[PDB]
Ligand SMILES: O=c1c(-c2ccc(O)cc2)coc2cc(O)cc(O)c12
Ligand SMILES: [Br-]
């Protein structure tokens with residue numbers, strides 16, 4: 252599939268930088284014809300067939316195809332795609348209140364935690380209903396619309412690892428951030444929608460405590476901890492957190508993907524269910 256090959260700068264003016272990663276940089280932009288504002292994600296293309304640098308066309312096309320499907324208040328939306336020799340440029344919905352990660356750096360109450368978590372669950376319910384596994388859920392990939400309200404609204408971003416799961420499981424080269432990946436990822440096993448549910452358990456643990464459940468001193472330690480389900484609820488952090496909240500986490504941080512709560516289970520769980 253090919254994308255718009257006119258110069259993006261003929262149609263958009265860019266401004267402040269919103270985010271920066273290994274192969275991508277994201278800039279605020281404004282569309283000249285409408286005055287409407289967006290986030291332009293510039294993704295570096297591969298220069299040769301066998302290069303490890305840049306993102307493969309196959310990977311870019313997968314991400315774009317998934318993004319085009321999505322329309323939901325808790326997930327980022329895609330406006331347009333441009334490309335040139337060096338980059339694919341995604342014109343994405345602008346979410347200006349920063350990362351959940353940076354907001355958290357500023358411990359919540361259980362209500363504040365569940366207000367975020369319910370939105371995340373709603374977004375993931377939508378995604379999983381479309382058989383889309385995100386595979387990179389973490390506070391850095393949750394953006395706030397406006398961080399200056401008591402109950403910020405959020406959208407899930409970063410579909411760079413996202414895959415359609417048409418056969419219940421995928422078996423590809425897929426591996427996200429060690430603190431958040433499920434044991435099946437660590438062990439290079441077939442992956443499904445279940446991996447996201449584990450990541451949600453990790454996010455929930457962090458929301459409530461300010462601490463990461465599996466984090467070791469090196470990435471290898473973290474990965475080994477994940478695979479062994481080496482986490483516990485520290486009393487210093489969780490002493491005034493409800494046992495029902497801990498139950499929710501416990502049912503997500505389960506090694507066997509078949510025994511882990513699904514997104515539907517998570518919405519019916521007594522901690523979440525209205
Ligand atoms: O999507 C984003 C965003 C992003 C996208 C849309 C917004 O409205 C705001 C940030 C920011 O930094 C990144 C950084 C990355 O490495 C990868 C990404 O996908 C992103
Ligand atoms: Br700007």
Ligand SMILES: [Br-]
Pocket residue numbers: 376379380514515
């Ligand atoms: Br579902």
Ligand SMILES: [Br-]
Pocket residue numbers: 292327343408409410
């Ligand atoms: Br994104």
Ligand SMILES: [Br-]
Pocket residue numbers: 292314408409410411
């Ligand atoms: Br994206």
